[PDB]
């Protein structure tokens, strides 16, 4: 970003007086918004939990947050996707406990 003007090394590149271009809304693609934030809430308490979700929280308050994650990674196909789901559980679990 702050280019050294030399053609190799730890930030190589010719020096250019820079601009910083107007930000694209496309880069805000997955952006939340109160709209969806609301509807997705309302569908949750209407539709309810799903099968694997029901066992997911079960592994949580039992055989650790660990073992639950490994299942969740197998079940959803990605580690990252699993952690983000296991997290979502803990917040549901949070609600049930301390209301």
């Amino acid at each position: 970003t702050v280019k050294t003007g030399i053609a190799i090394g730890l930030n190589k590149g010719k020096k250019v007086t820079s601009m910083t271009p107007a930000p694209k809304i496309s880069y805000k693609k997955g952006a939340a918004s109160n709209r969806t934030k609301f509807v997705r809430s309302l569908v949750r308490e209407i539709a309810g939990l799903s099968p694997y979700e029901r066992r997911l929280i079960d592994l949580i308050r039992n055989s650790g947050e660990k073992r639950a994650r490994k299942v969740a990674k197998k079940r959803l196909g990605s580690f990252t996707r699993a952690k983000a789901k296991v997290e979502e559980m803990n917040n549901i679990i949070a609600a049930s406990r301390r209301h």
Binding site: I6, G9, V16, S18
Partner: protein, 194 residues
Amino acid sequence: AISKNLPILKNHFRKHWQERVKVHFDQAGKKVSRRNARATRAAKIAPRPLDLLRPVVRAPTVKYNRKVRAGRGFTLAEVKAAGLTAAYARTIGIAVDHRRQNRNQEIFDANVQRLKEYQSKIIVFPRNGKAPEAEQVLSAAATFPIAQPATDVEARAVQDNGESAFRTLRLARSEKKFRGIREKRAREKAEAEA
């Protein structure tokens, strides 16, 4: 079979290649078409000039960024900075490009410069019928060439700050290599605490 002292050839003809031979016998007569249809385009385009006004653009890759190249369009930043709308700019002789941004002032400034210099050099005819005729100029690109900038003068002063340029590169490279390693040995300096 194999014999004699010859190079090993690799001629891919084991596949019914003759079903697919394209012999450009029409190279000649197609030039005539490509003309005759440029000619008759140039007509009904009234006095307009066949081609759009196109930007300067630096050209990508370490191989090629030394040169400068006509880009596709003008950004939206350059068009408003030229004091006109993109939507209207298209209807004149100008090419716009909504994807493609400015992170280099010296290409921006020199591109808004083209836009200004272009307007000033064309006459946009009024919306009714009657006009001041004007002859027909065919190329915008001939008229507004793109040239490569100035980088330096014919001569200057020798200035030797003593640093060898080789070694500057060497140390520069070593820097890269171990930065990660060093990023580690340091982390364990924080972790080396009581």
